Amino acid sequence: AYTNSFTRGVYYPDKVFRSSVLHSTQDLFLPFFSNVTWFHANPVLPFNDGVYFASTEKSNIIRGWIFGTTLDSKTQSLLIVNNATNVVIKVCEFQFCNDPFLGVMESEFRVYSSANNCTFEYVSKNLREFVFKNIDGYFKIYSKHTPINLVRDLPQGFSALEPLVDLPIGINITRFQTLLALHRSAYYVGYLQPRTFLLKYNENGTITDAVDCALDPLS
């Protein structure tokens, strides 16, 4: 299936406070009214320039992503996981199952079978959006958690995404996947292009509205 975003995937281009100021930016955005894939419950996707990624549930079936160029050994990759404990970022050379996942006893993690040469570690319904990008050896992640009053369909509205993480890795990326918690006892993928937007800033400094300046003559 395919679906239509309406006004989705707007993130704060950077720090620096700001108030009521229709500020104009050039960056990598998800164009308004786009053609976003639909997935149910998954396969190896491309990256090619950033990614929008939403998801909907009350349980937690979406348990992180895996990135990289080959998703195996012989080249390095990232791995972002969340068991019922908390997030586990990790950067080694792995050996990934071609269909990697984790179970739910509640024993799991048939994800990889190798953790060699680790160069970075870290340990510690609902709509959960994420924007992933990778520039100059930094892997930036923006995110937002809005509550839907549906269960698993893409809604309409405006909600800007706030920066979360910054990782000075150096890693090359060309592909990525997803991770799901099986049954033993809905998600979308947009892509980002270089656009020019007009963001409206509130008096507290939040982005409340935007204009995509390449949609139509009025814009």
Partner 1 sequence: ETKCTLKSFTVEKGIYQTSNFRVQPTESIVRFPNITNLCPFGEVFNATRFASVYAWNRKRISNCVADYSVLYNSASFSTFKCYGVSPTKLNDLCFTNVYADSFVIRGDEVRQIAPGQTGKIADYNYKLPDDFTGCVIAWNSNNLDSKVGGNYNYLYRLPLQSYGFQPTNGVGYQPYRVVVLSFELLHAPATVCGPKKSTNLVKNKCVNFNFNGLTGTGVLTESNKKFLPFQQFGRDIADTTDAVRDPQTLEILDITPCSFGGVSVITPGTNTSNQVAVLYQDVNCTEVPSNVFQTRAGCLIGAEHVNNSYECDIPIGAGICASYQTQSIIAYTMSLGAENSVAYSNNSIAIPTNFTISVTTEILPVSMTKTSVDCTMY
Ligand X SMILES: *[C@@H]1O[C@H](CO)[C@@H](O)[C@H](O)[C@H]1NC(C)=O
Per rule CB under 6 A, is residue 117 in the interface with ligand X?
yes
Per rule CB under 6 A, is residue 95 in the interface with ligand X?
no
Answer for which of 110, 202, 213, 219 binds ligand X (CB under 6 A) is 202
Nearest to ligand X of 34, 56 (CB atom): 34
Q: Are strands 77-82 and 87-96 parallel, antiparallel or unpaired?
A: antiparallel
Q: Which among ligand X, partner 1, none contacts residue 88 (Cβ within 5 to 8 A by kind)?
A: ligand X
Name the residues that contact partner 1, by CB under 8 A. Answer: 12, 14-19, 21, 136, 138, 162-163, 166, 168, 170, 204-205
- Asked if 11 and 195 touch (Cβ cutoff 8 Å), the reply is no
Q: Which among partner 1, ligand X, none contacts residue 162 (Cβ within 5 to 8 A by kind)?
A: partner 1
Q: Any residues with CB less than 8 A from the CB of 182 and at least 6 apart, and which?
A: 101, 102, 103, 104
Q: Establish how many alpha carbons lie within 13 A of residue 67's alpha carbon, considering only the half-sphere containing its beta carbon.
A: 25
Closest contact distance (angstroms) between CB of 207 and ligand X is: 12
Q: Which among partner 1, ligand X, none contacts residue 138 (Cβ within 5 to 8 A by kind)?
A: partner 1
Question: Rounded to whole angstroms, how far apart are CA atoms 203 and 44?
Answer: 42
Nearest to ligand X of 113, 117 (CB atom): 117
Structure tokens that stand for 182 in this block: 């099986």
Backbone angles phi, psi at 99, to 5 degrees: -125, 80
Question: Rounded to whole angstroms, how far apart are CA atoms 86 and 96?
Answer: 21
Closest contact distance (angstroms) between CB of 30 and partner 1 is: 20
CA angle (138 as vertex; 48, 128 as ends), nearest 5: 70
Among candidates 127, 131, 126, which has minimal Cα distance to 10? 131
Nearest to ligand X of 125, 165 (CB atom): 165
Binding mask 2-31 for ligand X (x = CB under 6 A): x-x---------------------------
Answer for which of 116, 146, 196, 219 binds ligand X (CB under 6 A) is 116
- Asked if 8 and 52 touch (Cβ cutoff 8 Å), the reply is yes
Backbone angles phi, psi at 93, to 5 degrees: -95, 125
**Segment contacting ligand X by CB under 6 A, of 22-30, 41-49, 201-209, 210-218:** 201-209
Binding site for ligand X (CB under 6 A): 2, 4, 35, 81, 83, 85, 88, 116-117, 123, 170, 172, 202-204
